[PDB]
Amino acid sequence: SHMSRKIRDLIESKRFQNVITAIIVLNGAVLGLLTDTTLSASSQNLLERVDQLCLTIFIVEISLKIYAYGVRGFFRSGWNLFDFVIVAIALMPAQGSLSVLRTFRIFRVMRLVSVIPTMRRVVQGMLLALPGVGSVAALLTVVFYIAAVMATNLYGATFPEWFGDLSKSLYTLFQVMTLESWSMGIVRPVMNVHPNAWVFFIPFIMLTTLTVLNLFIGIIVDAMAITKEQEEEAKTGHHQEPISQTLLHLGDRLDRIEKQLAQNNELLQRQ
Amino acid sequence: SHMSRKIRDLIESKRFQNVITAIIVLNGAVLGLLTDTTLSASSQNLLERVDQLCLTIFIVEISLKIYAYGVRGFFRSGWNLFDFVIVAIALMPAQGSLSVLRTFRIFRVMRLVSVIPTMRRVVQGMLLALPGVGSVAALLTVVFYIAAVMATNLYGATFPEWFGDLSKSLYTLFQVMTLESWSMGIVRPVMNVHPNAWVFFIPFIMLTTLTVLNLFIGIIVDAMAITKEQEEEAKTGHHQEPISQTLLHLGDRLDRIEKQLAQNNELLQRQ
Amino acid sequence: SHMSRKIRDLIESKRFQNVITAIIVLNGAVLGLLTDTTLSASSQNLLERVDQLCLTIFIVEISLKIYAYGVRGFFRSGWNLFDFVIVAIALMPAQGSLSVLRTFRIFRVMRLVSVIPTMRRVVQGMLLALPGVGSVAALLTVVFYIAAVMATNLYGATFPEWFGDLSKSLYTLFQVMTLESWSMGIVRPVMNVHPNAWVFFIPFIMLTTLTVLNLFIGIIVDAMAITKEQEEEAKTGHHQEPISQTLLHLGDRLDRIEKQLAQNNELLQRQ
Amino acid sequence: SHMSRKIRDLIESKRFQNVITAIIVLNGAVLGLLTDTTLSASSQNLLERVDQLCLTIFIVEISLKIYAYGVRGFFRSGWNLFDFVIVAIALMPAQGSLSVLRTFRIFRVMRLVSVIPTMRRVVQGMLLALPGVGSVAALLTVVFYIAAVMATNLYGATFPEWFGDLSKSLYTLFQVMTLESWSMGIVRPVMNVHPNAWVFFIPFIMLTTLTVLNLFIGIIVDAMAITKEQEEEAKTGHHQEPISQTLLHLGDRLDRIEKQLAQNNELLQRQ
Ligand SMILES: CC/C(=C(\c1ccc(O)cc1)c1ccc(OCCN(C)C)cc1)c1ccccc1
Ligand SMILES: CC/C(=C(\c1ccc(O)cc1)c1ccc(OCCN(C)C)cc1)c1ccccc1
Ligand SMILES: CC/C(=C(\c1ccc(O)cc1)c1ccc(OCCN(C)C)cc1)c1ccccc1
Ligand SMILES: CC/C(=C(\c1ccc(O)cc1)c1ccc(OCCN(C)C)cc1)c1ccccc1
Ligand SMILES: CC/C(=C(\c1ccc(O)cc1)c1ccc(OCCN(C)C)cc1)c1ccccc1
Ligand SMILES: CC/C(=C(\c1ccc(O)cc1)c1ccc(OCCN(C)C)cc1)c1ccccc1
Ligand SMILES: CC/C(=C(\c1ccc(O)cc1)c1ccc(OCCN(C)C)cc1)c1ccccc1
Ligand SMILES: CC/C(=C(\c1ccc(O)cc1)c1ccc(OCCN(C)C)cc1)c1ccccc1
């Protein structure tokens, strides 16, 4: 229709993005002021209404989009669904789920990612890089589970605060992996009772730090290449051959042209 | 034979892998529940039998493989030998070795690596990357030994808990390398007695952190390329020229084709 | 003019650079000696005059440059403007700004960067690499703000020293991100009152360490390539195609020449 | 001569290298046993003689080399000079230098690097990578000096143990850069007296961690490429074009051959 044609161009305008961005920043700034308990009852009521104002502008924004794109058209984008859920959850009447409350209204500032395209790209590259490190992430999960069971059996009776159960052991092994007081706080005290405890903890540190670095480098290198590759697909409109494919086949492509040159030289030398 | 033909296809089926995977997870989950000492005698006896059930399924699995592939055929794979040793050790009657016990039945969860091919590849790439960092690993071992001897001679009489002997010094130098309370916990106290101790510990930290990072980056970069190269060899069936060789000879290959072009141009300009 | 021709060649001479370098080192060395409060009143007065001498040589240096290049010519370089501001601020009479004093005369040693070209290049590569990581830096800023608001609401009433307000929470979240006593000092004490606090802090650590590593790797890789690319532009005088462009179009360029070879082969086989 | 022909081939034999390697390990193992103060006077005298035996074998080894290569020929290699100095210093009668003693006989184990070629290559690549990071290393040195002077002036009167003088401040800034108790141990106590101290320490941490990572990544990436490039020069005998040069000129080389193809196509289409 005509009403669903200008609205899309209003939605796609730089100023509309900037207006929404300004309202996200504003909502975020009022939620930060609401952390101050010394504020007067009138100041709290004022900011709570600016929060209500900000939220209503997001209901108008999402409705404008659902109409101008359609239910199937809007929910076709993962970013729009995320934007929908962020706003729709604020109007959820006693939602049934394992948690505590929804005071986490500050997760509305996470919309700065979906609304700013330079930031949307960064998060997109990182998210697209996750499936590819699933195996490394699972190997790290296996090492933690094996280690947690071993630590609970070995040290739980003598160190119940740190290794009393599986939960306690996963928490202190995560601390050990982060190298946080691993020796002065955990292993030297454990070695006073179990002198060969270093046989367990030093290999655990060696293995988990390498794996977590592997996981992190893997995510970073992939996210960087995916982003670069997507920017090129956006600029030209043509599909970008991933760099790994270009590098894997560089040898094959060079020898083929070397051979095609030699046969063109053979037909040339004898004419 | 006919009996050693369908069994191989049963062994190679996705559902058989999934059945074994489910039994590994199950065994791992019952071993984790067995860390809880508050459980009733009947609950402990129940889970211990589910452990026996899981173990028997692995004996049937390995036997099925040894028959369908042969002794020489099965033990030709490093992964199958690993799978054999994991299961066979659970039936080892008082094995003679320097240790304590075999309560580490949880190392059976490490079979998730050998049974899941996406995880088998990750560990394979990492293991194939180790011989190549042997020299860096040995340099780190030399620096630790020299440092341990120096620290024992310099500080062992005044700081016996940390440097009293070689073992004690290797342990606290490893802690120092991990930057764990290196200054507030070790070096500021040591400097109160030996004021120039920083001349020993600051260069030691500078050298070992660079070397350990070198070792780790070396493993990660190699494991990533080896995996990528093996996936390409698996996809096409052709041997993949390692990227280092492609990069080292990129210059040579380009100038050769440049020259072959210039000589083809020379025969063309004068015909 | 003739007076603004030899001065430029004096300014561009290796010995003039070395003379200025020697005066920066000298000024830096006297400012370091002036940190010693045990010095006699005559020794303090002596060094304070060597500081005055060093400062005057920089006024002569900058004036020499402004004359030999012109106001528009001198201030056309970001490095010269930096050099101008460093020297000009020492003669600022009670400048109006939010601070405390200008005792930070030691920021004059930062001129070793602008005066030594090998060091000017390093800092240049790093500075040119910053706009490109602005989105990652902003994502990290968003995560910190959301987390600070959450931590203030959740823990500020029970842990006011660490989370009492927004400022306090940003400071302890930065400490948590650096892994400094995150568990023994902050989270184990917080968990004694709020047992599921690990649900907040472990994901926060996981997310911020990956993002800060991403930010850092991004800066390092870019600064390294920018420097390499600028050295090549300086050596040849020709514009250097950035490596990302060379890599993105490597596939396209190889298939195009492959096709141009095949069509040259087609005209050759049938002549 | 004939006597200086077979000795060189004896010196270059795998077994001679292995004999020297075995004597280095042996000397290192006896020096490690000599750290144990509980040993009997006869055991100490025994090991001290095995040290004398090991040292004499190195005097015979070096003399054998100086004769078989010549004074100019032997001292032409940096590795041989290092090997000469390690052995010659053990016979230095009260050498005049600023130190304490030469009990550091364990630095003789550092010969395992010069004697094992796979380890000699690793250290060689690392040493050749140092001149290239000199500017980054100097930038880090400048930041530390500026920071040390600032910290001494700002905090030395109120925190004399940590910032009382320049030496004290460089030591605690190095600790701060390593993130070792930077907040719970240094900055939270400093902020109790100087509440805006975080304005100094948080930027200092941000800047030095990025620079030290830059320095380290720079060394690692260069050492890896230098080693790879030297192995190729050793294998073929031909000079290896450094990868940076191959990558910088990849664009130029591809467009040149693209143009040479188009002109060969132009002469072909009209014959
Ligand atoms: C196209 C980028 C990419 C990868 C890549 C990124 C950067 C780069 O420099 C090279 C490659 C990539 C390649 C392989 C990969 O394997 C994951 C293995 N699974 C089974 C765990 C993951 C990402 C990829 C991402 C998702 C699916 C498939 C491929
Ligand atoms: C050596 C080039 C390379 C890769 C590569 C190797 C051979 C080849 O033919 C093509 C590329 C590389 C790049 C990315 C990569 O991603 C997979 C990571 N997993 C963990 C998701 C693997 C190898 C690389 C490895 C680590 C860091 C940066 C680059
Ligand atoms: C084929 C991959 C590879 C290496 C490699 C991996 C990734 C990459 O981007 C480039 C190369 C490799 C190359 C050299 C190397 O040297 C080790 C030196 N020893 C003597 C300590 C190790 C791995 C390699 C692995 C085992 C043996 C030989 C080579
Ligand atoms: C610069 C490209 C490169 C290597 C390279 C340099 C020159 C060349 O002609 C070919 C490749 C590189 C890659 C891997 C590598 O592995 C050996 C590591 N050892 C420690 C096992 C060495 C250099 C590299 C170095 C560090 C990280 C990622 C990539
Ligand atoms: C030319 C180097 C470069 C980049 C680069 C450096 C090294 C390298 O190996 C590859 C590329 C670069 C490329 C992309 C980039 O995107 C930033 C995204 N913004 C929107 C946050 C940044 C730097 C760049 C720097 C400034 C502006 C534009 C490009
Ligand atoms: C795999 C090669 C690569 C990049 C690359 C991928 C594909 C392509 O066609 C060209 C290059 C790479 C290099 C730099 C880069 O910079 C942007 C970083 N942002 C965060 C500023 C992105 C990808 C790279 C990624 C991480 C570290 C080192 C190298
Ligand atoms: C040939 C390797 C190399 C460099 C290099 C190594 C690996 C790689 O992937 C690319 C290049 C290199 C290049 C530049 C460089 O600049 C140093 C700047 N100085 C002025 C501080 C250093 C090393 C180099 C080493 C010494 C002198 C000159 C060049
Ligand atoms: C993007 C490829 C690259 C470099 C590169 C960029 C452009 C170009 O045309 C050629 C190479 C690279 C490699 C090494 C390097 O060394 C200098 C380091 N200094 C600090 C000694 C610089 C850039 C690189 C950068 C960081 C890590 C690994 C690889």
Ligand SMILES: CCCCCCCCCC(=O)N(CCO)C[C@@H](O)[C@@H](O)[C@@H](O)[C@@H](O)CO
């Ligand atoms: C990838 C690795 C992921 C590790 C995740 C750890 C989750 C387990 C933490 C948890 O739920 N706890 C129960 C809830 O309290 C245990 C910790 O709280 C406990 O270890 C201690 O901190 C103290 O409670 C007891 O001293």
Ligand SMILES: CCCCCCCCCC(=O)N(CCO)C[C@@H](O)[C@@H](O)[C@@H](O)[C@@H](O)CO
């Ligand atoms: C690559 C580097 C590898 C370093 C490996 C260190 C192994 C040595 C540890 C060991 O076997 N110990 C004896 C067994 O107790 C010593 C430690 O336990 C000891 O240093 C202290 O922790 C206390 O026991 C004394 O205060």
Ligand SMILES: CCCCCCCCCC(=O)N(CCO)C[C@@H](O)[C@@H](O)[C@@H](O)[C@@H](O)CO
């Ligand atoms: C990218 C992340 C950037 C984080 C930047 C943090 C700035 C906030 C620090 C600040 O201005 N403070 C007020 C000035 O004191 C707060 C800290 O000082 C406070 O948290 C504590 O250290 C104690 O003062 C109270 O226990």
Ligand SMILES: CCCCCCCCCC(=O)N(CCO)C[C@@H](O)[C@@H](O)[C@@H](O)[C@@H](O)CO
């Ligand atoms: C690239 C960065 C390089 C930093 C190098 C630091 C060298 C300075 C260390 C030194 O020589 N000291 C004098 C010798 O004692 C000072 C330290 O010892 C001192 O800071 C404290 O540790 C205590 O002595 C006082 O509380």
Ligand code: NA
């Ligand atoms: Na740390």
Ligand code: NA
């Ligand atoms: Na710590």
Ligand code: NA
């Ligand atoms: Na730490």
